[PDB]
Amino acid sequence: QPPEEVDVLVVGAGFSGLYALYRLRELGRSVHVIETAGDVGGVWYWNRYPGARCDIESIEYCYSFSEEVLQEWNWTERYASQPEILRYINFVADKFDLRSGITFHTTVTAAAFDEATNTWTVDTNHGDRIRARYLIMASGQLSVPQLPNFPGLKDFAGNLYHTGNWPHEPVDFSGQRVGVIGTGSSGIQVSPQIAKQAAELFVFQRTPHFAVPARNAPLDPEFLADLKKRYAEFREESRNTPGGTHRYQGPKSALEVSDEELVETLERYWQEGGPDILAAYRDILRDRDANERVAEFIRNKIRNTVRDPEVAERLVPKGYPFGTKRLILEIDYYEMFNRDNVHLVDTLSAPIETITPRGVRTSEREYELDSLVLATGFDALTGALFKIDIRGVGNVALKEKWAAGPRTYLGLSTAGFPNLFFIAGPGSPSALSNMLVSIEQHVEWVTDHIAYMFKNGLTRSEAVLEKEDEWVEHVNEIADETLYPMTASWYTGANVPGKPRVFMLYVGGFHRYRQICDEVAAKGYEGFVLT
Numbered sequence: 001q002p003p004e005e006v007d008v009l010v011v012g013a014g015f016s017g018l019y020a021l022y023r024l025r026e027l028g029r030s031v032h033v034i035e036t037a038g039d040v041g042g043v044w045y046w047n048r049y050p051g052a053r054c055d056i057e058s059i060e061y062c063y064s065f066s067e068e069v070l071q072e073w074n075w076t077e078r079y080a081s082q083p084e085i086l087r088y089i090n091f092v093a094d095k096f097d098l099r100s101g102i103t104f105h106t107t108v109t110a111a112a113f114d115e116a117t118n119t120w121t122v123d124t125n126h127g128d129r130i131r132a133r134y135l136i137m138a139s140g141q142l143s144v145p146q147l148p149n150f151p152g153l154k155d156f157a158g159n160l161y162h163t164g165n166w167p168h169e170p171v172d173f174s175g176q177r178v179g180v181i182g183t184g185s186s187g188i189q190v191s192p193q194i195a196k197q198a199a200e201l202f203v204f205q206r207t208p209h210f211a212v213p214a215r216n217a218p219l220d221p222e223f224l225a226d227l228k229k230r231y232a233e234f235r236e237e238s239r240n241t242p243g244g245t246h247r248y249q250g251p252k253s254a255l256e257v258s259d260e261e262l263v264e265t266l267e268r269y270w271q272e273g274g275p276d277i278l279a280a281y282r283d284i285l286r287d288r289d290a291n292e293r294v295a296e297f298i299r300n301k302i303r304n305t306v307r308d309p310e311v312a313e314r315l316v317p318k319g320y321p322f323g324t325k326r327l328i329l330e331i332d333y334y335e336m337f338n339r340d341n342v343h344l345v346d347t348l349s350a351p352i353e354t355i356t357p358r359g360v361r362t363s364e365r366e367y368e369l370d371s372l373v374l375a376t377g378f379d380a381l382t383g384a385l386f387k388i389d390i391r392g393v394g395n396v397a398l399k400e401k402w403a404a405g406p407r408t409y410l411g412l413s414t415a416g417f418p419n420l421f422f423i424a425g426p427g428s429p430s431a432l433s434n435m436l437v438s439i440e441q442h443v444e445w446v447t448d449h450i451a452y453m454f455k456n457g458l459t460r461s462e463a464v465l466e467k468e469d470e471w472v473e474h475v476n477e478i479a480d481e482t483l484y485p486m487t488a489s490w491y492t493g494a495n496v497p498g499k500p501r502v503f504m505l506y507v508g509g510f511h512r513y514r515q516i517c518d519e520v521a522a523k524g525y526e527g528f529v530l531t
């Protein structure tokens with residue numbers, strides 16, 4: 001039930017929005033959060049599908065801002081399941097009395113900057129009108145589900161799900177003919193759970209994605225209690241890294257090594273599981289020949305996982321460099337295809353023509369299904385923003401200004417839109433880092449910036465157009481030194497039809513980006529104009 005006026009309005013109650021609330025209060029600022037969902041958690045509230053699990057270690061993917069949380073919470077598994085992460089979020093939410101600062105079931109429709117008085121007016125689908133000095137869009141990176149692009153969807157006779165909008169009551173696939181469309185992280189995690197229940201599971205794969213064993217395991221309770229002795233320290237080590245974790249930064253070039261040392265080295269990562277293999281060698285995302293030797297080793301591990309050679313071959317990713325679509329952690333996913341009741345439908349060879357009342361037609365034949373699961377992803381990074389009529393100076397639409405790709409200074413603001421801040425979004429490290437590291441830094445940087453504005457008695461903060469252009473050009477420029485922009489992924493907006501193909505993230509590493517933000521604030525916010 002939202003206030004008519006506030007210092008800062010926050011959109012979204014997932015990790016980012018909750019923390020922004022907590023810190024803004026500590027800083028003696030009035031602050032409120034609007035959230036479409038029924039409750040806190042963001043991705044961990046919405047993504048409730050069976051198998052949903054973090055692929056950053058529970059010990060790294062957690063808040064560090066509170067010593068008490070660090071000491072009191074007990075993680076249980078190398079990689080936390082979604083129910084567990086949702087209990088942690090509730091634990092924190094509870095601990096700091098956060099819900100009192102949040103309006104649920106409410107979706108922000110539009111926001112417009114008022115130049116006369118230097119404020120945002122912010123409307124919602126319940127007619128709430130809030131005036132705020134600052135607007136923080138804590139509204140996610142992977143928060144607006146994307147349906148795939150083919151017809152007959154509303155004609156399907158059975159039940160229809162998207163993993164990103166999963167039912168609050170467990171879904172029963174027992175005895176069903178089930179289809180999953182999509183084999184990114186969502187579909188990889190969800191499929192082996194549905195394989196346990198369905199009479200027949202059909203996995204509709206388009207481009208195969210690279211996946212490596214998670215090797216999840218219980219967490220040793222002693223290791224935990226040790227870790228806690230120096231938790232603050234351990235976390236500060238994670239902030240001083242490109243990826244926001246303890247990942248080893250392999251110093252060698254993947255080209256300098258024999259085939260023999262290369263295999264022995266990747267074999268050790270493969271038996272160990274997890275994503276650290278992405279940094280086995282310094283140049284894997286930088287040099288196509290280096291990349292390829294690593295990609296080959298992975299593809300061969302893939303072939304060897306599946307008994308039938310033809311099914312095995314269709315599982316092998318082709319045509320793009322390893323790691324350039326987000327790396328996936330799998331758990332019994334490749335093994336699944338050895339089962340009698342699991343069918344890999346290769347839609348590259350036979351593309352989907354349409355959905356029918358009965359199920360799915362490809363160019364080669366029709367599949368009958370009782371249920372269809374869409375693991376088809378998200379209109380990423382800009383999708384949630386673009387859903388909101390956001391309006392800056394001269395009445396510029398954010399959606400129009402960014403229609404060729406997101407334009408920002410430090411990913412934190414855009415020229416022409418003063419008092420507006422984007423948490424962990426395009427133009428910053430964002431999902432290229434452990435997101436809790438990217439999220440805590442952006443929250444602390446924005447909220448300090450806000451507090452600094454108040455201290456000094458100002459009320460207007462605007463990214464300077466020339467710095468914005470300079471920043472966007474720098475982002476593209478350093479991306480272009482890597483293999484990232486070369487591949488169609490949601491990072492480059494490739495999954496939404498008509499969306500501009502532009503790599504959206506800052507690739508220079510969390511550490512450098514935090515250093516660059518720190519010198520910006522240390523000079524009273526170079527590249528902003530403050531009045």
Ligand SMILES: Cc1cc2nc3c(=O)[nH]c(=O)nc-3n(C[C@H](O)[C@H](O)[C@H](O)COP(=O)(O)OP(=O)(O)OC[C@H]3O[C@@H](n4cnc5c(N)ncnc54)[C@H](O)[C@@H]3O)c2cc1C
Nearest residue numbers: 012014015016035036042043054055056107108139140435
């Ligand atoms: C299934 C899934 C698994 C993930 N696993 C990991 C992982 O292992 N490691 C990792 O580092 N990151 C991973 N993440 C990335 C995840 O985006 C971040 O880690 C972190 O959860 C993002 O937090 P957030 O608060 O920025 O956004 P979100 O958690 O997305 O919260 C955004 C909230 O804003 C609300 N919202 C949006 N628009 C409006 C509006 N118009 N009005 C009102 N409310 C609105 C949404 O409903 C949502 O609740 C994963 C993401 C997905 C989708």
Ligand SMILES: CC(=O)c1ccc[n+]([C@@H]2O[C@H](COP(=O)([O-])OP(=O)([O-])OC[C@H]3O[C@@H](n4cnc5c(N)ncnc54)[C@H](OP(=O)([O-])[O-])[C@@H]3O)[C@@H](O)[C@H]2O)c1
Nearest residue numbers: 053054055148149182183184185186206207326375376377
């Ligand atoms: C932490 C963790 O383990 C976890 C778990 C879950 C999510 N996450 C995080 O969220 C991000 C998104 O992952 P996701 O799986 O939900 O989404 P995706 O990666 O966008 O894959 C979409 C898939 O659907 C297929 N596809 C799309 N359109 C299609 C079409 N029109 N016709 C037919 N098929 C279509 C598309 O095919 P192709 O050829 O690759 O476009 C692909 O197979 C992740 O990267 C993590 O950041 C993390």
Ligand SMILES: [Cl-]
Nearest residue numbers: 055326431435
């Ligand atoms: Cl992720």
